[PDB]
Amino acid sequence: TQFEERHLKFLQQLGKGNFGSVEMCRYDPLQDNTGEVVAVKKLQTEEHLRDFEREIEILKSLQHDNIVKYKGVCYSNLKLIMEYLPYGSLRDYLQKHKERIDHIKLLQYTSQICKGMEYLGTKRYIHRDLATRNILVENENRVKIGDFGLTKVLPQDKEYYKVKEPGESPIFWYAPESLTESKFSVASDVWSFGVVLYELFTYIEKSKSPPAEFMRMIGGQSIVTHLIELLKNNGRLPRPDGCPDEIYMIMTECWNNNVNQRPSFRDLALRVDQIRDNM
Amino acid sequence: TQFEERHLKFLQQLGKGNFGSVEMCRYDPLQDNTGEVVAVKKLQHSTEEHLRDFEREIEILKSLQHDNIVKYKGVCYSAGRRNLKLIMEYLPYGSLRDYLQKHKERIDHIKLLQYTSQICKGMEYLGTKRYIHRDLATRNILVENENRVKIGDFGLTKVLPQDKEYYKVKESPIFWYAPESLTESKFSVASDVWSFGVVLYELFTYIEKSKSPPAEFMRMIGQGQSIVTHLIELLKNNGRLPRPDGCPDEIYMIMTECWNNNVNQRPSFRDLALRVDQIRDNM
Numbered sequence: 301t302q303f304e305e306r307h308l309k310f311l312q313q314l315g316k317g318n319f320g321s322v323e324m325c326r327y328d329p330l331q332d333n334t335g336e337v338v339a340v341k342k343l344q345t346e347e348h349l350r351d352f353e354r355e356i357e358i359l360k361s362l363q364h365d366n367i368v369k370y371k372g373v374c375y376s377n378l379k380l381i382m383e384y385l386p387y388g389s390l391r392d393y394l395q396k397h398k399e400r401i402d403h404i405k406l407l408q409y410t411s412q413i414c415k416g417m418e419y420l421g422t423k424r425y426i427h428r429d430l431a432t433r434n435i436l437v438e439n440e441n442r443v444k445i446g447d448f449g450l451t452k453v454l455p456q457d458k459e460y461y462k463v464k465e466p467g468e469s470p471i472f473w474y475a476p477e478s479l480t481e482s483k484f485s486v487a488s489d490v491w492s493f494g495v496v497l498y499e500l501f502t503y504i505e506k507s508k509s510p511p512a513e514f515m516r517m518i519g520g521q522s523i524v525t526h527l528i529e530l531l532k533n534n535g536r537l538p539r540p541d542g543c544p545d546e547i548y549m550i551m552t553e554c555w556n557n558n559v560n561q562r563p564s565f566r567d568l569a570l571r572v573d574q575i576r577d578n579m
Numbered sequence: 580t581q582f583e584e585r586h587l588k589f590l591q592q593l594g595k596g597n598f599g600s601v602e603m604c605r606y607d608p609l610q611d612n613t614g615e616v617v618a619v620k621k622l623q624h625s626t627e628e629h630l631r632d633f634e635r636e637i638e639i640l641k642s643l644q645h646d647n648i649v650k651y652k653g654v655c656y657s658a659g660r661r662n663l664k665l666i667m668e669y670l671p672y673g674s675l676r677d678y679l680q681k682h683k684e685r686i687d688h689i690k691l692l693q694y695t696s697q698i699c700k701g702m703e704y705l706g707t708k709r710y711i712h713r714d715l716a717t718r719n720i721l722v723e724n725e726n727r728v729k730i731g732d733f734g735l736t737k738v739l740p741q742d743k744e745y746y747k748v749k750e751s752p753i754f755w756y757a758p759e760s761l762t763e764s765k766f767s768v769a770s771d772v773w774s775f776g777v778v779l780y781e782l783f784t785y786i787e788k789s790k791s792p793p794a795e796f797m798r799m800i801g802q803g804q805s806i807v808t809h810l811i812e813l814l815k816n817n818g819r820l821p822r823p824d825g826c827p828d829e830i831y832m833i834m835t836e837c838w839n840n841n842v843n844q845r846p847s848f849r850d851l852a853l854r855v856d857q858i859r860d861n862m
């Protein structure tokens with residue numbers, strides 16, 4: 301399905317980053333306000349352009365209930381057209397609607413994230429950026445992974461990917477081996493999933509955020525250096541208040557220093573599903 | 580048991596109020612560091628009027644015999660029967676407020692509901708004596724062990740008149756008070772139930788200071804009038820504390836029913852016990 305620029309009508313900025321923006325647009329070839337609302341990602345380097353071309357093809361290759369839908373591309377620079385999900389990021393949804401979201405609902409979302417991550421796994425894709433800000437809410441009962449800007453394809457013969465990036469990284473979501481050796485794997489995605497579970501069960505309360513807690517535990521060396529040393533000494537995020545024992549246990553296993561001792565996404569889905577039924 | 584002052588050995592201050600102090604002492608008649616540790620309540624700078632209230636507080640506690648009520652052990656007079664002290668069992672884990680702040684990472688919703696159940700049973704028992712607590716707050720509940728809490732102070736507790744279901748009191752914990760307590764100083768079993776709703780709120784927020792009843796009410800209040808005036812008006816307009824993060828639906832519903840403006844629409848402590856117990860089993 302082709303998208304002409306001339307019919308792409310700017311409605312609102314959804315987000316602006318470094319090197320990228322996302323906009324709500326109406327695709328309106330009949331110019332009567334009837335056309336479909338879509339999300340449009342675009343660049344705001346040759347290196348960022350390369351990453352974006354690869355990001356488009358990664359998303360185009362994904363078809364899953366819990367992955368934001370690829371719709372197409374729009375050229376003049378390149379724009380990536382996606383389905384618009386009206387409730388926005390899980391991060392913002394949960395801050396807004398937390399008084400109406402119980403533990404059962406959190407475990408529903410958790411399950412769906414695990415299924416999307418399991419599917420990424422089958423393509424040998426490493427997300428690298430698993431955070432509630434990168435998950436989207438389609439409705440009360442469905443979330444989707446909604447950004448693939450850092451996603452890498454494993455080499456054919458290796459279980460990890462080493463990255464040379466000099467930009468800001470979401471370090472308070474990163475596995476120790478990601479921080480020390482820039483090694484990214486399914487196991488570093490599982491570490492990051494543990495931090496997502498933490499975000500959900502703290503209800504995105506600012507005073508309990510991963511950066512708040514890590515900086516409190518840290519107190520002339522970079523924050524990265526202090527964080528590696530703290531994780532090496534088995535410093536961890538604390539149990540969220542009222543977090544069920546089996547959910548805290550899942551988080552602590554995700555945060556094993558040893559990549560090879562972290563759970564599989566298939567196992568996580570099963571264990572989350574069982575906690576949810578048990579409740 | 581009579582307790583002689585000469586054998587009561589001060590170990591540590593447990594707490595200090597406007598008119599009172601509580602101390603950990605060893606009762607050591609054998610003066611070999613072997614005697615039993617007890618909690619001792621005394622008046623700070625006694626009036627005759629505070630002394631009268633304290634004598635009534637003593638008789639209230641002496642009349643209570645219940646697994647979830649701190650044990651009365653006896654009284655201690657200074658020389659010449661000048662100064663009354665109330666001797667209680669010492670509960671080593673202290674206030675629920677402090678225990679939960681300390682040990683929250685090891686206390687799940689099941690445990691909170693066990694404590695909640697036990698508070699309801701103590702309150703049901705108070706009810707049968709026609710006693711109104713007036714001060715139901717996690718700072719006034721004590722932790723004997725991981726599986727047992729007790730109501731642990733009766734310093735504001737009143738006996739109902741013979742012919743009425745409320746007592747009218749001629750600083751107060753206003754952020755735990757029922758609207759009719761704030762406007763008319765009317766205290767009843769229903770105003771105790773309102774306060775219990777706030778205890779449930781305290782427990783399910785895990786005593787987090789940014790979510791405390793005073794923090795939330797003051798945020799809702801934002802003013803050329805007393806805080807009490809702003810609070811009455813807020814509660815009249817159905818302002819309420821918000822649902823604690825991850826509070827089960829049926830526990831938030833219990834909280835909201837305890838905070839009905841109409842005294843006659845608030846649940847009974849017998850019903851609250853049943854409902855809390857059932858949520859706990861269902862979990």
Ligand SMILES: Cc1cc(Nc2ncc(C)c(N3CC(O)(C4CC4)C3)n2)sn1
Nearest residue numbers: 314315322339384385386388434446447
């Ligand atoms: C209120 C609201 C609605 C939004 N919808 C929407 N729909 C699709 C996408 C791809 C999208 N994005 C990508 C985004 O940068 C972050 C998830 C990664 C926001 N947002 S956003 N806010």
Ligand SMILES: Cc1cc(Nc2ncc(C)c(N3CC(O)(C4CC4)C3)n2)sn1
Nearest residue numbers: 593594601618667669670673719731732
């Ligand atoms: C660490 C610790 C242990 C405590 N134990 C204890 N044992 C009995 C009583 C009566 C008591 N009190 C009365 C108190 O003023 C408030 C609850 C009403 C503390 N404390 S206290 N702290």
